[PDB]
């Protein structure tokens, strides 16, 4: 995990664009310039937007990085981040990640905020978030998720923001949010949910905003009556895409009628 | 050509929740060109970086919304981020 001779930047970082990023961070003249492990240790934040990066190989050597922001690159693999235990903010939006290697996050116990917005994740590993006990922000919106493993969020007690919008979720596991007592902001809009389990939001006593629109709610499917009663009791929580209170924004497919309208309250 | 809306989103999701909260507050007072609307304080309350990017492109345009977002980032001290935003639009 260390370099024992001063080494050209281009050698430690094979990605030409990432090596350019490292050179700018260290403020050297050229990527051919020789860098020591002491100089690499001074880097604690990286910002590389839209830099056509394919690989962050060589980032294993930057043990003090706390702030890592690499949006709109071409990353397919984040294995090289497994041991950056000082990471506290990790924003990887608009990349092309299709999977998370199992245990890729088990060592990142200092993470506050994680964004995997606009990636290509079709599934999540079991227990993938179990070690991120200090996580407050989790954005998974605009992926290709087909389901959520049971208990996937059970360990994220400090979570205040959870965005699952724009995926292809057809169901939610029983009790999938039951441990998220501090959650203020839950986005489920634009999925394929026909219903949710009875009392799925019942234990979210801190919820301030929820987005339920653009889901094919089935007015006869089991559990829709509880959802309708929940919406009628928490009408101000429910928001539309413009950001306004809209308890009617969740709509029964086919008929188009508000899920709220199912029961009279 | 669509590049500036992407740059606005990339910048705003890079921010911590605290920095987004201060950014949105700064939007209330940041100087605006003649004839352009100001986003109401209440409208900002529920907005994440996705929501804010759409609102900024609908009040201002893609092109002016990016210039304004760079102005606010400069007033917050985040000079590096404002540079990558201005760089991406041109």
Numbering used by the authors:
A (entry chain A): 2 to 266
B (entry chain D): 1 to 90
Question: What does the original paper state about this entry?
Answer:
Assembly of inflammasomes is initiated by activation of sensor proteins, and activated senor proteins recruit and oligomerize the adapter protein apoptosis-associated speck-like protein containing a CARD (ASC) composed of a PYD (pyrin domain) and a CARD (caspase activation and recruitment domain). ASC is a bipartite protein composed of CARD and PYD, and its oligomerization is mainly triggered by homotypic PYD interaction. We developed an ASCPYD-targeting protein binder using a non-antibody protein scaffold, termed “repebody,” which is composed of leucine-rich-repeat (LRR) modules. The repebody scaffold has a horseshoe-like structure with a size of 30 kDa and high stability.
The most promising rB7 clone was expressed in E. coli and purified, and its dissociation constant (KD) against ASCPYD was estimated to be 1.5 nM through ITC. There are two protomers of ASCPYD complexed with rB7 in the asymmetric unit because of crystallographic packing. The root-mean-square deviation (RMSD) value between two protomers is 0.237 Å, which implies these complexes are rigid and structurally almost identical. Structural analysis revealed that ASCPYD tightly interacts primarily with the concave side of rB7 through hydrogen bonds and salt bridges. Both Asp6 and Asp10 of ASCPYD form salt bridges and hydrogen bonds with Arg73 of rB7, and Asn14 of ASCPYD has hydrogen bonds with Asn50 of rB7. Arg188 of rB7 forms a salt bridge and hydrogen bond with Asp51 of ASCPYD, and it also has a salt bridge with Asp48 of ASCPYD. As a result, seven ASC molecules are found nearby, causing a steric clash with rB7. Among them, eight residues are shown to interact with rB7 at the same time, and five residues are involved in ASCPYD oligomerization. Taken together, rB7 is likely to effectively inhibit ASC oligomerization by binding to the interface of ASCPYD oligomers, generating fragmented ASC specks with a low degree of oligomerization.
